[PDB]
Ligand binder design. Structure first.
Ligand SMILES: CC(=O)N[C@@H]1[C@@H](O)[C@H](O[C@@H]2O[C@H](CO)[C@@H](O[C@@H]3O[C@H](CO)[C@@H](O[C@@H]4O[C@H](CO)[C@@H](O)[C@H](O)[C@H]4NC(C)=O)[C@H](O)[C@H]3NC(C)=O)[C@H](O)[C@H]2NC(C)=O)[C@@H](CO)O[C@H]1O
Length: 203
């Protein structure tokens, strides 16, 4: 199990100022529904996966300090018709991965058997839902495949999560700085775990 190397102590050291909504036990329990997460490839692939998932989360959530996007749009994309927006509801970032947009809440809701499309606030109000959405995105959108491949691709995870805004950005621009922070956190977490992060890092 990945919990053999990401212990409670490792997690707490990485996220010492987390909002109490987010717990190690919550992550562990939710991860049980994604048995391939953190158990795919070599031990070093498992370590890179955890570092990549949690490094991206560190960026998105501000060290797990935030549940909701700070100072958010309602993130209703009316061109995206498969998952209809609910009147008055807002699809701004929520949970560890800052799940955003009707299309993501809708697809996650369908896959998870949860009322996320009509009640997106569940992601900020139920920590089991919050962790499940982060793992859902990681697995369904195939950040998992990017990082656990030989060779690993951390850059691929950034592209999938927020590539339009963070990849292919001028050096030093806000999106580029966000991207570089993800890389910094990933590499720091890899250092904790004693694993080489690989070379395919930035986008
Ligand atoms: C310089 C620096 O690093 N500053 C930090 C702040 O960036 C940070 O605030 C958080 O910032 C991130 C951007 O890095 C922001 O991320 C939002 O994340 C969601 C989820 O990934 C994105 O949604 C994606 O949208 C695309 C389409 O554009 C979809 O294709 C994709 O499916 C979506 N992904 C998911 C998982 O749903 C948003 O696009 C993205 N927003 C922007 C503007 O880039 C977070 O919401 C910010 N977090 C908070 C809590 O507000 C801040 C955190 O405290 O810390 C600074 O240091």
């Amino acid at each position: 199990s990945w919990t053999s190397f990401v212990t409670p102590a490792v997690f707490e050291g990485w996220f010492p100022n987390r909002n109490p909504f987010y717990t190690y036990d919550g992550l562990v329990s939710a991860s049980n529904g994604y048995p391939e997460f953190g158990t795919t490839g070599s031990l070093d692939d498992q370590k890179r996966e955890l570092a990549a998932f949690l490094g991206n989360i560190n960026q998105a959530s501000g060290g797990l300090q935030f549940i909701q996007e700070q100072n958010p749009s309602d993130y209703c994309d009316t061109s995206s018709t498969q998952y209809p927006c609910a009147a008055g509801k807002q699809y701004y970032g929520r949970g560890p991965i800052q799940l955003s947009w009707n299309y993501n809440y809708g697809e996650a809701g369908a896959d998870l058997g949860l009322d996320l499309l009509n009640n997106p606030d569940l992601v900020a109000q139920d920590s089991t839902v919050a962790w499940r959405t982060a793992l859902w995105f990681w697995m369904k959108r195939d950040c998992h495949g990017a990082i656990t491949a030989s060779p690993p691709s951390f850059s691929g995870t950034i592209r999938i999560i927020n590539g339009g805004l963070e990849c292919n950005q001028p050096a030093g621009s806000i999106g580029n700085m966000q991207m570089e922070n993800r890389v910094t956190y990933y590499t720091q977490f890899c250092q904790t775990l004693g694993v080489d992060p690989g070379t395919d890092l930035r986008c």
